[PDB]
């Protein structure tokens, strides 16, 4: 009824007593080990708070303080990144020459011959070349000295210590009650207006007052040491008005609604800065101001304490129709009592956001000299793609956990959840058909092309010079977005990205961005993407929908979310649990995202990135995507075999660590197959023989050695599979793009 602060004073004593008792959180694990399974169970159940206790308040307090701990760890990581830029980097030299100097912020110690990894990156500096893009981010912020990076590192560690204090404080001293956590209307109001809205407003303020004049002077050619410090622009208004003449009018145009006077630093240019290859910083300042106003408006929607506002329960209960039964009734009670349902929704949207971020950061590069740093572009695209895919698989996992643990049929009668469960067979069968159709009509096109090329019939191929599959809808969308400044957005000076069409943006003789034309190979690879995403969706959705029961096992919810099987009967019921569906979906997401990042790497190396000479643009792989990416053999030869030459001849150079990691990641991936292909009965019997050998010499441990559980065997297999494959692609990508970029 009334939104208010409610806490409990000193609920948990701050003591090291439970630190000395592993497994204290669990009723089963607190008694201590009997076998070696207890060692793994302690780590596996450490963060399953809902398994430790059924009290929602204690779970919520644990989640809150764990989130504070994660924020503190993230701030430690960020402060270390700023510190290594301040102390072990060539950032100032790179500021003086951002084209011919490779960013580097890691220096290795001279021991066992490893100082060869301190490569000649330029700027009179030796170190490991970095691909995280921090230099371009720091330059965009207006940072010009190592002292400012030192200040951010120290301030980050202070805030990191404040986050760790808050986690201790809000668990051990003043832990909020359950009704505090269930104020979702107040949480949404504060996180929209106050977190996102005020954050965007404050960053617009930083951009306007610091980032715009410093980067304007940097792009004008002024030496970074001769550029005035940001507080000089704050205090001296005339120095600001020298660059942006509307600052002489002060805040009077803002309060007299003469907003068009601010058009010199609040622009809608679009496109890229030709000097730096990044987005216009004035455009970003106007963007963040508009986003701030929109989010401040959005944060006033929900009713808290002053009558006005929406009740989310009323909105959900009012949205029902003739086809959908009771509609969204009961979803408010689900989303205010189940942390797992909230985690599923938030993980799905956060992962999708990360993938969208990867696409929007490559297409409209927002940092100066980011686009011509091909290593950074490839790295950040691949990284954010992978983070997105992992978060989406986690969304499937925690949706399944909600279905097993927190679902109540009494509170879900004829609502959307009940009706979705009631036609799960139709959903799964139709999705299965869609996946089969997509696999046939996408991969069989490649197989047809490989067979036709191998039969000496290139005229029977699916290609641009043969039977054509032109992606006409995407081409029409590209043409529409190219023509946007004419009619449908007349106040925009340029299109949002050069990828829609138009001219080539070149910085330092290298392509920053250029049109990305789509042909038959793009059609084929996009339908491959659709197929792989649909199969991953099929596995995860089948796991969610059949988590509680199926025609095979009608009481699957009683077996739990994570169980190996229900025995060899009914023909065999291995991997029926929803956890095992997450386990298979991890492989399929790996396959999907591997194809996505391979498509990105080959297409930008072949059709975007390259050297702009007097005659034209010479790409890195010379436009061989449109010629050979329509066959599996073309991929294997011209991408995999050709582009891995940099990582296999990296020995004896600074990139030799990438060759070592390439080999070690192939090893780790192969090592995973012994866990995946085998079963624990063999390993338990082998351990029996080894235990006999230890018993003979009186060296048998009291903690009895057991083979890993079936679920742990699957988890170890998939973890080592993902690590090996992803690190193989990581070393291959980074060695290739650092050596040829």
């Amino acid at each position: 009824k009334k939104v208010k602060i409610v806490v409990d004073g000193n609920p948990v004593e701050t003591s090291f007593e439970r630190w000395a008792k592993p497994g204290h959180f669990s009723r089963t694990l607190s008694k201590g080990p009997s076998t070696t399974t207890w060692i793994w169970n302690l780590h596996a159940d450490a963060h399953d708070f809902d398994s430790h206790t059924s009290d929602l308040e204690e779970i919520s307090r644990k989640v809150f303080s764990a989130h504070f701990g994660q924020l503190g760890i993230i701030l430690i990581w960020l402060s270390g990144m700023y510190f290594h830029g301040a102390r072990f980097s060539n950032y100032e030299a790179w500021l003086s020459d951002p084209i011919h100097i490779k960013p580097s912020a890691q220096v290795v110690w001279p021991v066992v011959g490893q100082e060869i990894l301190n490569g000649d990156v330029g700027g009179g500096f030796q170190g490991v070349q970095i691909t995280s893009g921090f230099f371009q981010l720091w330059r965009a912020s207006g940072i010009t000295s190592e002292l400012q990076l030192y200040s951010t590192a120290i301030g980050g560690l202070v805030l990191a210590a404040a986050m760790f204090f808050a986690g201790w404080f809000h668990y051990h001293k003043a832990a909020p009650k359950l009704e505090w956590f269930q104020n979702v209307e107040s949480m949404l109001n504060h996180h929209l207006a106050g977190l996102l809205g005020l954050g965007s407003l404050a960053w617009a303020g930083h951009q306007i007052h610091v980032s715009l004049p410093i980067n304007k002077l940097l792009d004008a050619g002024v030496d970074p040491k001769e550029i005035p410090l940001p507080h000089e622009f704050i205090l001296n208004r005339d120095l600001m008005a020298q660059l942006y003449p509307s600052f002489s009018k002060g805040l009077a145009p803002f309060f007299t609604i003469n907003w068009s006077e601010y058009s010199d630093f609040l622009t809608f240019q679009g496109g890229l800065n030709p000097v730096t290859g990044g987005l216009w910083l004035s455009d970003q300042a106007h963007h963040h101001l508009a986003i701030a106003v929109l989010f401040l408006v959005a944060g006033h929607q929900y009713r808290t304490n002053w009558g006005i506002g929406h009740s989310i329960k009323e909105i959900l209960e009012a949205h029902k129709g003739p086809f959908t039964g009771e509609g969204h009734k009961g979803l408010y009670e689900i989303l205010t009592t189940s942390w797992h349902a909230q985690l599923a929704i938030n993980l799905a949207l956060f992962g999708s956001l990360s993938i969208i971020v990867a696409h929007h950061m490559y297409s409209m590069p927002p940092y100066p000299y980011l686009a011509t740093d091909y290593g950074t572009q490839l790295s950040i695209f691949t990284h954010h793609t992978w983070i997105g895919g992992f978060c989406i698989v986690g969304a499937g996992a925690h949706a399944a956990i909600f279905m097993v643990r927190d679902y109540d049929p009494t509170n879900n009668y004829n609502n959307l959840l009940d009706r979705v469960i009631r036609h799960r067979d139709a959903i799964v069968s139709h999705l299965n058909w869609v996946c089969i159709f997509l696999g046939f009509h996408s991969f069989g096109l490649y197989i047809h092309n490989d067979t036709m090329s191998a039969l000496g019939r290139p005229q029977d191929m699916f290609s641009d010079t043969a039977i054509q599959l032109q992606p006409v809808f995407a081409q029409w969308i590209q043409n529409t977005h190219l023509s946007a400044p004419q009619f449908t957005a007349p106040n925009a000076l340029a299109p949002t990205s050069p990828v829609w069409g138009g001219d080539v943006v070149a910085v330092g003789g290298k392509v920053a961005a250029m049109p990305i034309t789509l042909g038959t190979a793009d059609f084929m690879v996009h339908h491959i993407h659709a197929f792989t995403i649909h199969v991953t969706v099929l596995i995860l959705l089948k796991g969610v929908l059949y988590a509680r029961s199926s025609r095979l096992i009608p009481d699957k919810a009683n077996l739990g979310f994570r169980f190996p099987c229900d025995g060899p009967g009914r023909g065999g019921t291995c991997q029926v649990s929803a956890w095992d569906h997450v386990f298979l979906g991890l492989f399929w997401m790996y396959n999907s995202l591997s194809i996505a990042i391979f498509h990105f790497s080959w297409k930008m190396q072949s059709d975007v990135w390259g050297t702009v000479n007097s005659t034209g643009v010479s790409h890195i792989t010379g436009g061989n995507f449109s010629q050979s990416a329509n066959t599996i053999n073309g991929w294997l030869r011209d991408f995999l075999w050709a582009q891995s030459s940099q990582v296999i001849q990296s020995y004896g150079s600074a990139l030799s660590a990438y060759g070592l990691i390439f080999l070690g990641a192939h090893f780790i991936w192969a090592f995973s197959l012994m866990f995946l292909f085998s079963g624990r009965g063999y390993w338990q019997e082998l351990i029996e023989s080894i235990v006999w050998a230890h018993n003979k010499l009186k060296v048998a441990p009291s903690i009895q050695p057991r083979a890993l559980s079936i679920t742990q065997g699957r988890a170890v297999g998939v973890a080592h599979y993902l690590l090996g494959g992803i690190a193989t692609t990581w070393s291959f990508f980074l060695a290739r793009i650092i050596a040829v970029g």
Partner: protein
């Protein structure tokens, strides 16, 4: 190089032999399954009880050893 690859070959031979010999000698029974002879040479498992019994038959030891033999001859 011949030394290193010959010791790799020895590792492959000894590991394939270890899998096959352990499968043959534990075919009649083990501590995990003392009555394994009653179930025959090939059977899927003994179920998730007693910790889990995936790939416990002697046939499964053959199946595991085919991978190691392929690796060795490779």
């Amino acid at each position: 190089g011949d030394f290193l690859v010959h010791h790799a070959i020895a590792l492959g031979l000894h590991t394939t032999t270890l899998i096959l010999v352990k499968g043959a000698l534990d075919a009649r029974g083990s501590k995990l399954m003392p009555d394994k002879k009653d179930f025959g040479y090939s059977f899927p498992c003994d179920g998730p009880g007693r910790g889990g019994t995936c790939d416990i038959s002697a046939w499964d030891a053959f199946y595991l050893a085919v991978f190691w033999m392929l690796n060795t001859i490779g």
